[PDB]
């Protein structure tokens, strides 16, 4: 395909070229309709600066870079790739997963003094929410929350997920915002600022921690030392630091696609009206009429030591979708005599 | 040879 | 929302009606529906009758499904299908042999034996009749004590 | 082929 | 589940209340986790839980 | 609603009118929800015929169905064109308010009926 | 057709040319009678600056730009296009949707200090209201409201929609009004001010959020730094910032057309007088006599976790329009025996 | 054909 | 190939 | 053979 | 072709 990759050089030409190649590959995969979950495993094998790349067992086979330019101080890379969009996979027949973006906090407010970027966590969780909402393939964002999610309180995680109707809750801590000064006699000072982050995803059905990853990137701080920067403004997010943080958010989305996309989606029972039950997933999540679903009885217990545990009882109950709304759906129980055993909170999975 | 994304899992 | 006849925990009661060395009888009144009667009699061989007696007699012969449904206060438990019976027109529902002992066993485990069928008096709609396990264990002990004291000959 | 380059809605800016 | 907290904490009172619920409803229904608390399995529906708790709180 | 001692299941429903039926009319029996049940639709039960100078009669399974629809909390509605009312359509509904206890008493009496006539 | 597109250059000639092309295309589609809902999906494929554009499955097939001029500092584009106005579609047989414009707020009053444009949210919601009223094809505006609509209170949304008689409520937050300074030694300073906005549309029947989009544009701030600008005046709206905000409002209208236009319109039952019911839609909404409508029994519940849900019971009741007023209509129930089951709040849909 | 260029009522100015 | 606007939907 | 040199996630920096 | 003024309407 014909794609362009744009990335600014911070300290190494190799890193900027690799970032531009990643951007071009991401655009090519998005246009080709291929899954973006598989991209996050291709990057490690892209550390080398070889003109030709060979891969096996992937939707992309050979990568050939034809043009590399450093116009306006940032590397531009033009490549041609062959993408094979597979019609099958463990991610195409699943309903969309609702995700709640939790509180992202700055561990050390001391590091945010330069620029007074103290609301960077909130304005970055907003970016992560919008990235998951309008860029992901298998995720739906149900908003942000002001509460902090911890692994010590699975019950609170379950309650907050129930309140917001979220299958997973994602929250992080920003651990490094410090900067160093590089000085040259010919020119002015260069301030390279750090952005480290540790993201954690919790399963709202049982309170377990299902995802855990750490990110660290560096970018130039173009603003003055004594200048105050607003994190909601376009001045912050159009700068080199802003571009780096946007790339970090994209990597978060790609990692979530890599890890959670092929987990089987489990819509929950919202209400039971005799022989008809209601599902928390609807038309906007990919539900189509005539779908057959299998019911699981949910029983998740905190064990004797306070650690969350999971236990599902298999059921002989199968349901079919009768009416579909934008955000909910109605299902009819195919075994009327077993309809009395369905309670609120039981989960279902689509029969393939 | 690229690592393959996680396969289908239940619970 | 269909019709479900079950005694609420405040309404459920079990009684030993006949307690003699010739017959034991245990009765569970199902409110608004009728009675469920377990009858055992003196004989050389093990025998138990379960009779679902209805206030309004059976309108047509129907296939009935006997299931061991969990009560509402038991989340995370699936229902066990027990059997399929046939309830006959204008006759009390009858279960006998090992299935009646199975109904008693499923009651001893805190579960609800549920009969589901299409009711003629109800525009041929599906209805459920459940036996409540509340306040059952003491009367089951009395019933078994009576069974142990039955004459071993007819 | 030839992938397009149309921009989309900004995530924050 | 729902949990009952004894006004006067005691191991024997906690166990006797657990037995009272089990005798009324059925086996493996209530359990004493310490000298004060007794956990009773309850329906998921809020309306059914109120109806369930109404019958249980009147046990002698 | 009348049930009589007999060997067979029998129930008669008679809509007795103060002003007698003017002419024989086709009547529609529907199970209309009460006002205090929004979001519920009406079920068409059947079509009867009310005869001239006779009380309306429903028998067989339909009378038991009327009792059942009353047990669910609904209103059995007979709709027809009244001769005494300038041949205009009128509705007659049976209320389900204060029905449950008397339905239990009725079922008990039906239980205690002689099995021979 | 013969159309002209006018757009001022802010920072890139490509953006100004694209905006002029969008303006010319919008005028051509409006004159041609074609639906304006489909325009919002054509823009992404217009990022390239190709002299010729090829499209499939659209009312426009080929676009050829013949004249490009930069007179008076703004790009003028003259094009010829072939538009095929389809007589069919999911948007032509539906009644008009009444929409209430909610409160639009400035999240940070600090950003509005320059020019003291603190009532920019209100005076922009007025523009959005007028744009939906006198420019849209499938919308009727029932005015503005001073209350804020949130996803946490579906009951309040339903009550406000009932009070104003609105099917949908649209409200937003203005998230960026900051500006940067570009300095040249030859000339004076250039102040480029930002305008970011997040619009949200709620369904008044159930309180659900049915639409969510974010807008961000930049334009020159021609006024002095210490000058006070009145947002109700023509000085503000005739400036470059005002033209940008007007274009943003037009994009809001086009996105609403793209998303909500083909939703089936559901007029509500206002009053029942025996066998005749009243409809909240009338002559001004497209109701014609002899129309056949199908009744749905409405039952929308808040579930156990406080989240809105929808549930409609299908009905055997069909209605026909007997008398038509400008704002209401009278319908006769075709099944008199079922007329007793019609309550206030039941919805109807036109039978096609 | 040839689309017209008649102006309409201003939205705010 | 242009994406098509949303189709007719009920509720 | 020829071992790769792709970097991984930093442990602290 | 000029648009035509509103036609006769009742109420």
| The pair of three-digit structure tokens given for residue G178, joined into one six-digit string | 């900051």
Pairing of strands A276-279, C80-87: unpaired
Put simply, the answer to whether G2 touches H1 (Cβ < 8 Å) is yes
Nearest to D7 among G47, G196, G213 (CB): G47
G52 burial level (CB within 10 Å; 0-12, 13-18, 19+): exposed
Question: A175, A106 in Cβ contact below 8 A?
Answer: no
- Chain I residues with CB inside 8 Å of G57's CB? 1-2, 4
- Chain G residues with CB inside 8 Å of F89's CB? 336-337
| E20 touches C: beta carbon within 8 Å | no
| The pair of three-digit structure tokens given for residue C130, joined into one six-digit string | 């459940």
Strand partners, G83: G60
Tell me the Ramachandran region of residue G273: left when phi exceeds 0, alpha when psi lies from -120 to 50, beta otherwise.
beta
Please, do chains A and D touch (3+ CB pairs < 8 Å)?
Answer: yes
| The pair of three-digit structure tokens given for residue G97, joined into one six-digit string | 């949707």
- Beta carbons within 8 Å of A308's beta carbon, 6+ residues apart: A154, A206, A207, A208, A300, A302
**Rounded distance between C-alpha atoms, residue G135 and residue G249, angstroms:** 11
| C69 touches A: beta carbon within 8 Å | yes
Put simply, the answer to whether A216 touches J7 (Cβ < 8 Å) is no
Of the candidates A221, A287, A321, A210, the one whose C-alpha atom is nearest the C-alpha of residue A256 is: A210
Q: Which residues of E touch A (CB under 8 A)?
A: 43-45
| C67 touches A: beta carbon within 8 Å | yes
Cα C149 to Cα C17, C21, C43: the distances in Å are 15, 6, 12
Question: E41, C74 in Cβ contact below 8 A?
Answer: yes
Question: Chain F: nearest CA to C73, how far in angstroms?
Answer: 25
Question: G19, G44 in Cβ contact below 8 A?
Answer: no
**Rounded distance between C-alpha atoms, residue C122 and residue C144, angstroms:** 37
List helix spans (H) across G58-153.
120-134
- Other residues' Cβ atoms within 10 Å of the Cβ of residue G316: 14
- Other residues' Cβ atoms within 10 Å of the Cβ of residue G13: 12
Question: Chain A: nearest CA to J10, how far in angstroms?
Answer: 7
- Chain G residues with CB inside 8 Å of F42's CB? 315-316, 338, 340-341
- Beta carbons within 8 Å of G329's beta carbon, 6+ residues apart: G278, G279, G281, G282, G283, G287, G321, G323
**Rounded distance between C-alpha atoms, residue A286 and residue A107, angstroms:** 38
- Chain A residues with CB inside 8 Å of B11's CB? 264, 266, 310, 312
F50 burial level (CB within 10 Å; 0-12, 13-18, 19+): buried
Residue G54, classed as helix, strand or coil, is: strand
**Rounded distance between C-alpha atoms, residue C53 and residue C68, angstroms:** 20
Preferred mutation among F27, F30, F42, F76 to probe G, highest tally of G CBs within 10 A: F42
Kind plus residue range of the DSSP H or E element containing A254: helix A240-260
Kind plus residue range of the DSSP H or E element containing A18: helix A13-32
Put simply, the answer to whether G259 touches I6 (Cβ < 8 Å) is yes
Put simply, the answer to whether G234 touches H5 (Cβ < 8 Å) is no
Resolution of the coordinates in A? 3.0
Nearest to A313 among C67, C77, C114 (CB): C77
Kind plus residue range of the DSSP H or E element containing G164: helix G154-164
Question: G74, G7 in Cβ contact below 8 A?
Answer: yes
E strand residue ranges, chain G: 3-8, 52-54, 60-69, 74-83, 97-101, 105-106, 139-144, 168-176, 179-182, 190-203, 209-220, 269-273, 276-279, 292-298, 312-324, 329-333, 347-350
How far, in whole angstroms, is CA D1 from its chain's centroid? 17
Nearest to G180 among A235, A278, A344 (CB): A235
Of the candidates A204, A123, A223, the one whose C-alpha atom is nearest the C-alpha of residue A163 is: A204
**Rounded distance between C-alpha atoms, residue G73 and residue A77, angstroms:** 33
Experimental method: cryo-EM
| The pair of three-digit structure tokens given for residue J13, joined into one six-digit string | 């920096």
Question: Chain J: nearest CA to A214, how far in angstroms?
Answer: 7
- Beta carbons within 8 Å of A137's beta carbon, 6+ residues apart: A35, A36, A37, A91, A257, A261
Q: At what angle do helices C98-108 and C137-148 cross, to 10 degrees?
A: 140
Length of chain K: 11
Of the candidates A301, C78, C113, C108, the one whose C-alpha atom is nearest the C-alpha of residue E41 is: A301
| E50 touches C: beta carbon within 8 Å | no
Of the candidates A59, A61, A64, A66, the one whose C-alpha atom is nearest the C-alpha of residue A84 is: A59
| The pair of three-digit structure tokens given for residue A106, joined into one six-digit string | 């700055």
**Rounded distance between C-alpha atoms, residue C114 and residue C112, angstroms:** 6
G339 burial level (CB within 10 Å; 0-12, 13-18, 19+): buried
**Rounded distance between C-alpha atoms, residue G216 and residue G82, angstroms:** 31
Please, which chains are in contact with J (at least 3 CB pairs closer than 8 A)? A
Please, do chains E and A touch (3+ CB pairs < 8 Å)?
Answer: yes
**Rounded distance between C-alpha atoms, residue G142 and residue G126, angstroms:** 12
For D1-13, b where at least 16 C-beta lie within 10 A, e where not — what string?
Answer: eebeeeeeebbbb
Chain C nearest-CA residue for A312: C76
Of the candidates A160, A139, A140, the one whose C-alpha atom is nearest the C-alpha of residue A150 is: A160
First CA to last CA distance, chain A: 33
Of the candidates G229, G237, G213, G208, the one whose C-alpha atom is nearest the C-alpha of residue G131 is: G237
**Rounded distance between C-alpha atoms, residue A263 and residue A260, angstroms:** 5
Question: Chain E: nearest CA to A53, how far in angstroms?
Answer: 56
Residues in F 5-44 with any Cβ partner in G closer than 8 A: 28, 30, 32-33, 35, 38-42, 44
Chain D nearest-CA residue for A246: D11
**Rounded distance between C-alpha atoms, residue C37 and residue C42, angstroms:** 17
Kind plus residue range of the DSSP H or E element containing G15: helix G13-32
Sheet of E37-40: strand order equals E2-5, E37-40, E30-32
First CA to last CA distance, chain D: 30
**Rounded distance between C-alpha atoms, residue G42 and residue G60, angstroms:** 9
Tell me the Ramachandran region of residue A319: left when phi exceeds 0, alpha when psi lies from -120 to 50, beta otherwise.
beta
**Rounded distance between C-alpha atoms, residue E48 and residue F9, angstroms:** 37
| I7 touches A: beta carbon within 8 Å | no
**Rounded distance between C-alpha atoms, residue A162 and residue A347, angstroms:** 13
Please, which chains are in contact with B (at least 3 CB pairs closer than 8 A)? A
- Chain A residues with CB inside 8 Å of E43's CB? 343
List helix spans (H) across A43-140.
120-134
Put simply, the answer to whether A316 touches C114 (Cβ < 8 Å) is no
Put simply, the answer to whether G297 touches F79 (Cβ < 8 Å) is no
Of the candidates C39, C32, C36, the one whose C-alpha atom is nearest the C-alpha of residue C127 is: C32
Pairing of strands A276-279, A269-273: antiparallel
**Rounded distance between C-alpha atoms, residue G270 and residue G277, angstroms:** 7
Tell me the Ramachandran region of residue A72: left when phi exceeds 0, alpha when psi lies from -120 to 50, beta otherwise.
left
Question: Chain I: nearest CA to G332, how far in angstroms?
Answer: 23
| G176 touches D: beta carbon within 8 Å | yes
- Chain G residues with CB inside 8 Å of F28's CB? 337
Pairing of strands E2-5, C125-130: unpaired
Question: G298, G345 in Cβ contact below 8 A?
Answer: yes
Of the candidates F71, F92, F73, F97, the one whose C-alpha atom is nearest the C-alpha of residue F81 is: F92
Question: A82, A151 in Cβ contact below 8 A?
Answer: no
How many helical (H) and strand (E) elements, i.e. helices and strands, does chain K have? 0, 0
Question: Chain G: nearest CA to D9, how far in angstroms?
Answer: 7
Cα A84 to Cα A1, A24, A33, B6, D1: the distances in Å are 12, 16, 9, 19, 12
**Rounded distance between C-alpha atoms, residue A211 and residue A260, angstroms:** 8
- Other residues' Cβ atoms within 10 Å of the Cβ of residue F36: 7
Put simply, the answer to whether D11 touches A28 (Cβ < 8 Å) is no
- Other residues' Cβ atoms within 10 Å of the Cβ of residue F61: 19
CA angle A256–A258–A264, rounded 5-degree value: 85
> Count of A–E CB contacts within 8 Å?
6
- Beta carbons within 8 Å of J6's beta carbon, 6+ residues apart: A43, A44, A45, A46, A47, A48
């Amino acid at each position: 395909y014909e794609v362009t990759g744009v990335a600014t050089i911070v300290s190494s030409e190799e890193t900027a070229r690799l970032h531009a190649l990643e951007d071009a590959l991401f655009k090519a995969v998005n246009f080709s309709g291929a899954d973006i979950g598989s991209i996050s495993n291709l990057m490690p094998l892209l550390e080398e600066s070889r003109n030709e790349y060979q891969f096996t067992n992937h939707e992309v086979r050979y990568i050939l870079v034809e043009s590399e330019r450093k116009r306006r101080g940032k590397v531009e890379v033009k490549i041609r790739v062959d993408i094979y969009p597979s019609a099958t996979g463990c991610h195409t027949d699943q309903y969309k997963k609702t995700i709640l973006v939790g509180n992202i906090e700055v561990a050390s407010p001391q590091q945010a003094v330069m620029g007074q970027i103290y609301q960077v966590g909130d304005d970055f969780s907003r970016v992560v929410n919008r990235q998951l909402d309008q860029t992901s393939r298998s995720f739906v964002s149900v908003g942000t929350t002001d509460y902090s999610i911890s692994s010590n309180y699975p019950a609170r995680t379950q309650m907050i997920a129930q309140d917001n109707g979220a299958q997973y809750i994602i929250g992080g801590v920003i651990t490094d915002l410090t900067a160093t000064v590089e000085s040259q006699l010919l020119q002015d000072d260069i301030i390279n600022r750090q952005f480290a982050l540790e993201m954690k995803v919790f399963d709202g059905k049982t309170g377990h921690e299902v995802f855990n990853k750490a990110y660290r990137e560096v970018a130039r701080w173009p603003f003055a030392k004594t200048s105050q920067v607003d994190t909601r403004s376009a001045r912050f997010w159009a700068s080199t630091y802003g571009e780096m943080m946007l790339r970090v958010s994209r990597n978060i989305m790609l990692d979530l696609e890599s890890e959670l996309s092929c987990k089987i989606t489990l819509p929950e029972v919202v209400a039971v009206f005799g022989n008809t039950v209601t599902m928390d997933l609807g038309r906007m999540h990919g539900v189509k009429e005539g779908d057959k679903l299998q019911l699981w009885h949910t029983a998740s217990f905190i064990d004797q030591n306070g650690l969350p545990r999971n236990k599902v009882s298999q059921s002989e109950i199968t349901l079919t979708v009768s009416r579909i709304y934008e955000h909910e759906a109605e299902l009819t129980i195919d075994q009327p005599n077993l309809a009395s055993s369905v309670q609120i909170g039981d989960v279902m999975n689509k029969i393939l | 040879q690229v690592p393959e994304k996680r396969q289908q899992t239940l619970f | 929302m269909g019709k479900r006849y079950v005694a609420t925990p405040q309404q459920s009661q079990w009684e030993m009606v006949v307690n003699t060395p010739l017959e034991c009888q245990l009765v569970h009144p199902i409110p608004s529906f009728g009675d469920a009667v377990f009858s055992s009699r003196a004989n050389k061989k093990i025998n138990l009758d379960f009779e679902l007696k209805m206030r309004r007699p059976m309108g047509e012969t129907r296939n009935v499904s006997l299931i061991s449904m969990p009560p509402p206060w038991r989340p995370g438990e699936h229902a066990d299908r027990i059997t399929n019976l046939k309830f006959f027109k204008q006759f009390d529902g009858y279960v006998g042999g090992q299935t009646a002992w199975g109904i008693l066993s499923e009651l001893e485990k805190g579960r609800y034996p549920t009969f589901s069928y299409q009711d003629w008096q109800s525009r041929d709609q599906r209805i459920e009749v459940a036996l409540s396990s509340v306040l059952f264990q003491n009367k089951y002990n009395a019933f078994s004590d009576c069974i142990s004291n039955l004459l071993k000959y007819s | 082929c030839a992938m397009l380059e149309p921009i989309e809605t900004d995530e924050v800016t | 589940y729902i949990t009952f907290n004894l006004l006067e904490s005691d191991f024997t009172t906690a166990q006797r209340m657990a037995d009272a619920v089990n005798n009324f409803l059925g086996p493996q229904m209530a359990s004493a986790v310490d000298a004060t608390s007794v956990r009773v399995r309850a329906p998921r529906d809020v309306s059914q839980r109120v109806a369930f708790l109404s019958a249980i709180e009147n046990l002698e």
